[PDB]
């Protein structure tokens, strides 16, 4: 009697995976996507005549779920070559910019990182069960900043590790939950070189959008875009989904894959469990944005860190040449520190870092300003990871997926895929 067997809300990797799992079981499947595009927090675009990535793009074979999908659909890796750096910079909170030899730069960040994750081997024997250990549950009382003050790092190492960690937090390190960082490093084999190789090294052949289209075509599910969901009501043996144009779609089961910071704008009747509402209100930490800057001068191959109080926390050469100039890939930890769609502020901060250059153009994506992300990658605040099962738990015939709800690579494409497989199995148990 329902319009569809299962409705999936959201066309990111969590939604595409769930829709594919449901479709291949023969269920009549519908996916509703708020934007006029798919991919969610993965978005490939173009700038200054080149391909650029505004969100997620990089993967690794140490991430099980996304790698198995690439095997399923015959997609290989595309390498961004490690390359030698000409300059590595650190910008401290005082505003001073230092140029360090790239060989000193790598040694100091590794020392600081390895001391911060010294206990990951003991505390997370099973990174896919983060709360297995007691130590893990007692560490969720502390922030990443709490550990860094005890490590006794030099001024350079602390600025490096704090900038790198502010980037993973999308926020200041005093807000950043400690165990979530150790668990992610545990997922990469408890090893520094293995984990660092997963970061900005390999992209998917055909792009993230190609693998998302592969799964959705394979699912057979009906896909609608520019259809935001505004409310969900639990009916008798199903659910009622209301779109922003007030039309009602009925289904036996509905799967939520929207980012956690967007649940505030969807109404649920009846109300969800209070443990769920708590993560509904708090949200996830990251307030990041992504920015690309085109400069007339050819800076070669540069990398820079800036600490939490400064705007351009992660800068790296995307491409360079004398004819082109330099295209810089920049990640902003916090929205409050700079408006990426304000060019004049962007030009000043690039010039502060690289005095003497004039920006020819800028391309930005402010994920925190976007109504359908309201934040960047998944980052847990202090105490959140221990209550993660409140966010994963099904509420009647409403299932919940998404990178934030995953147990492994929660800050990654892989975590979204993992949650999609779990959601598909929970669909299989309700429809039987
Ligand atoms: C700048 C940035 C860089 C990143 N780089 C990497 C990387 O290099 N490697 C890696 O592994 N991961 C990376 N990530 C993380 C990765 O992008 C995410 O973890 C993953 O895409 C999350 O998948 P998801 O489906 O759970 O969320 P989403 O991709 O956000 O999917 C949710 C979908 O639901 C839609 N939606 C929202 N609200 C509604 C609504 N009311 N109704 C209908 N639809 C709605 C949204 O528009 C969206 O399409 C990055 C993230 C960011 C922000």
Swiss-Prot record:
GO terms for biological process: alkaloid metabolic process; nicotine catabolic process. It is found in: Periplasm. Changing residue 412 to H: 12-fold increase in activity. Binds 1 FAD per subunit. Its EC number is 1.4.2.2. The keyword Coiled coil does not apply. Disruption phenotype: Deletion of the gene prevents nicotine catabolism. Predicted to be exported by the Tat system. The position of the signal peptide cleavage has not been experimentally proven. Keywords: Alkaloid metabolism, FAD, Flavoprotein, Nucleotide-binding, Oxidoreductase, Periplasm, Signal. Its cofactor is FAD. Could be used as a potential therapeutic for the degradation of the critically addictive component in tobacco, nicotine. May decrease nicotine's circulation through its destruction so that an effective concentration is not reached or maintained in the brain. NicA2 rapidly reduces blood and brain nicotine concentrations when administered to rats at single or multiple nicotine doses relevant to the nicotine intake of cigarette smokers. Its main location: periplasm. Changing residue 377 to N: Loss of activity. Pathway: Alkaloid degradation; nicotine degradation. (S)-nicotine binds at residue 331. Induction: Expression is up-regulated in the presence of nicotine. PANTHER family: AMINE OXIDASE (PTHR43563), AMINE OXIDASE [FLAVIN-CONTAINING] B (PTHR43563:SF1). Overexpression of the gene has a modest toxic effect on cell growth, suggesting that the reaction product pseudooxynicotine (PN) is toxic for the bacteria. Coexpression of Pnao, which converts PN to 3-succinoylsemialdehyde-pyridine (SAP), can rescue the growth of bacteria by alleviating the toxic effects of PN. Monomer in solution. Homodimer in solution. Forms homodimers in the crystal. Belongs to the flavin monoamine oxidase family. This is Nicotine dehydrogenase. It comes from Pseudomonas putida (strain DSM 28022 / S16).
């Amino acid at each position: 009697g329902f319009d569809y067997d299962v409705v999936v809300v959201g066309g990111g990797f969590a939604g595409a995976t769930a829709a594919r799992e449901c479709g291949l079981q023969g269920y009549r499947t519908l996916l509703l996507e708020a934007r006029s595009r798919l991919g969610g927090r993965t978005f490939t675009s173009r700038f200054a005549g080149q391909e650029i990535e505004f969100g997620g793009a990089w993967v690794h074979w140490l991430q099980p779920h996304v790698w198995a999908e690439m095997q399923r659909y015959g997609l290989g890796v595309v390498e961004d070559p490690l390359t030698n750096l000409d300059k590595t910079l650190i910008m401290y909170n005082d505003g001073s910019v230092e140029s360090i030899s790239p060989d000193e730069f790598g040694k100091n960040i590794r020392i600081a990182f390895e001391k911060l994750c010294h206990d990951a081997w003991e505390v997370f024997p099973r990174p896919h069960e983060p709360m297995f250990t007691e130590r893990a549950r007692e560490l969720d009382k502390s922030s990443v900043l709490d550990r860094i003050k005890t490590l006794g790092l030099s001024r350079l190492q602390q600025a490096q590790i704090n900038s790198y960690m502010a980037l993973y937090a999308g926020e200041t390190t005093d807000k950043f939950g400690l165990p979530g960082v150790l668990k992610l490093f545990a997922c990469g084999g408890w090893n520094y070189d293995a984990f660092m190789d997963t970061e900005t090294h390999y992209r998917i052949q055909g792009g993230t959008i190609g693998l998302i289209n592969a799964m959705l075509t394979d699912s057979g599910a009906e896909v609608r875009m520019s259809v935001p969901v505004t409310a969900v009501e639990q009916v008798n043996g199903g659910v009622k989904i209301k779109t922003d144009d007030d039309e009602i779609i009925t289904a036996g089961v509905v799967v939520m894959t929207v980012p956690l910071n967007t649940y505030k704008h969807i109404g649920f009747t009846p109300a969800l469990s209070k443990g769920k509402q708590r993560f509904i209100k708090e949200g996830q930490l990251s307030k990041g944005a992504k920015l690309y800057v085109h400069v007339k001068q050819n800076l070669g191959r540069v990398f820079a860190f800036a600490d939490e109080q400064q705007p351009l926390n992660w800068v790296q050469t995307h491409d360079y040449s004398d004819e082109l100039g330099t295209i810089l890939s920049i990640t902003i930890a916090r929205k409050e520190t700079i408006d990426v769609n304000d060019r004049d502020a962007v030009t000043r901060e690039v010039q502060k870092m690289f005095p003497g250059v004039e920006v020819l153009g800028t391309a930005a994506y402010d994920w925190t300003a976007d109504p359908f992300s309201l934040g960047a990658w998944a980052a847990y605040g202090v105490g959140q990871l221990s209550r993660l099962k409140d966010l994963q738990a099904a509420e009647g015939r409403i299932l919940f997926a998404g990178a934030e709800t995953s147990n492994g690579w929660h800050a990654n494409i892989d975590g979204a895929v993992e949650s999609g497989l779990r959601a598909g199995r929970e669909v299989k148990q309700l429809l039987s």
